[PDB]
Amino acid sequence: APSEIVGGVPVFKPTYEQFEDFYAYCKAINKYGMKSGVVKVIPPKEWKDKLDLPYSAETLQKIKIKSPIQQHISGNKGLFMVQNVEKNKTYNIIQWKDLSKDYVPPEDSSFNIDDFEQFRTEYTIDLSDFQNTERLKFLEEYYWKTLNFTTPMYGADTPGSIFPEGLNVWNVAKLPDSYLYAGLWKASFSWHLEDQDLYSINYIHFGAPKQWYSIPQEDRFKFYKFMQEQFPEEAKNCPEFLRHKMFLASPKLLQENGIRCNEIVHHEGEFMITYPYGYHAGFNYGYNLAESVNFALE
């Protein structure tokens, strides 16, 4: 299968025909993901129809944000290290959509089954805003300019899924183990490579887009050494600290260090596939709900 476009990152727009086989499709297009850190995969229209929108009141009620994480980040510029916090409290989707009213981007009680049935018209957020490229460029630049001035809060992994139960095609929840992230403006995921160095699919069910950065496998050693440069203290008692501590590094910085860095914007209804030995990191542009699993092809 051919790559449709490129934002430094391969973009695939498969037809339901080939899209049908997830394993055969992934195995027929792995040579691209092993070059660039990640690959985007837009599902076909006849697939998006298989979805049930809006989600039923129960589907929404099932959503439970277990142990939210706040991030305390510190660092001059380009380099930052994040100190994820604890959130003993727990939220439901309605509470999270409301919580996103505190973590708003710049410009320029007990609950009943009825509450969710009502919320079936408010679970989304206006996306026409993020349709502008220069708009996204702005947010990203503001994000790097002001990372240590805020304590972002993520909806750290929580088992579950919102994909149609009767859905077997591309069922990220059940493939022939799924988790939900709760996005919030400026919430960031540092540099890392999936455990056991496996693959993973990340799907944004709804909400603001995600920003993605990936290091081409070829540069995973330049990148590694450069990270041993800064933070030399860890270069001692650590064989693997990129998977021990949380570190953020801007592309603009890496670029000007002989380390290529891919960048792409992950939108609602799209799939991202992280490949083995493909370092990746990024942040959220605001309120969203994402689902992801880790798999293997061999």
Is there a domain that residue 39 lies in? yes
Q: Are 45 and 172 in contact (CB under 8 A)?
A: no
Side by side, the strands of the sheet bearing 153-154 are: 153-154, 69-74, 79-84, 247-249
Is there a domain that residue 2 lies in? no
Note down the domain range covering 86: 9-298
Distance between CA atoms of 176 and 266, rounded to whole angstroms?
A: 25
State the CB neighbour count (10 A cutoff) for residue 237: 8
Tokens of 123: 């679970």
Distance between CA atoms of 207 and 103, rounded to whole angstroms?
A: 14
Domain at 280, CATH number: 2.60.120.650
Distance between CA atoms of 247 and 256, rounded to whole angstroms?
A: 18
Q: Are 10 and 36 in contact (CB under 8 A)?
A: yes
Is there a domain that residue 240 lies in? yes
Question: Determined by which method?
Answer: X-ray
What is the DSSP secondary-structure string of the chain?
----EESSSEEE---HHHHT-HHHHHHTSHHHHTTSSEEEEPPPHHHHTTS-SSPPHHHHHH--B-S-EEEEEE-SSSEEEEEE------B-HHHHHHHTTTSPPP------HHHHHHHTTTSS---GGGG-HHHHHHHHHHHHHSSTT---EEB---B---S-TT--TT-TTS----EEEEE-TT-EEEEE--GGG-EEEEEEEEES-EEEEE--GGGHHHHHHHHHHSSTTHHHH-S--TTTS-EEE-HHHHHTTT---EEEEEPTT-EEEE-TT--EEEEE-SSEEEEEEEE---
Distance between CA atoms of 182 and 44, rounded to whole angstroms?
A: 25
Q: Which residue has the tokens 């809006």?
A: 54
Q: How far is CA 295 from the centre of its chain?
A: 16
Tokens of 200: 């993973």
- Structural domain tally of the chain? 1
Q: Are 187 and 283 in contact (CB under 8 A)?
A: yes
Is there a domain that residue 4 lies in? no
Is there a domain that residue 1 lies in? no
Is there a domain that residue 231 lies in? yes
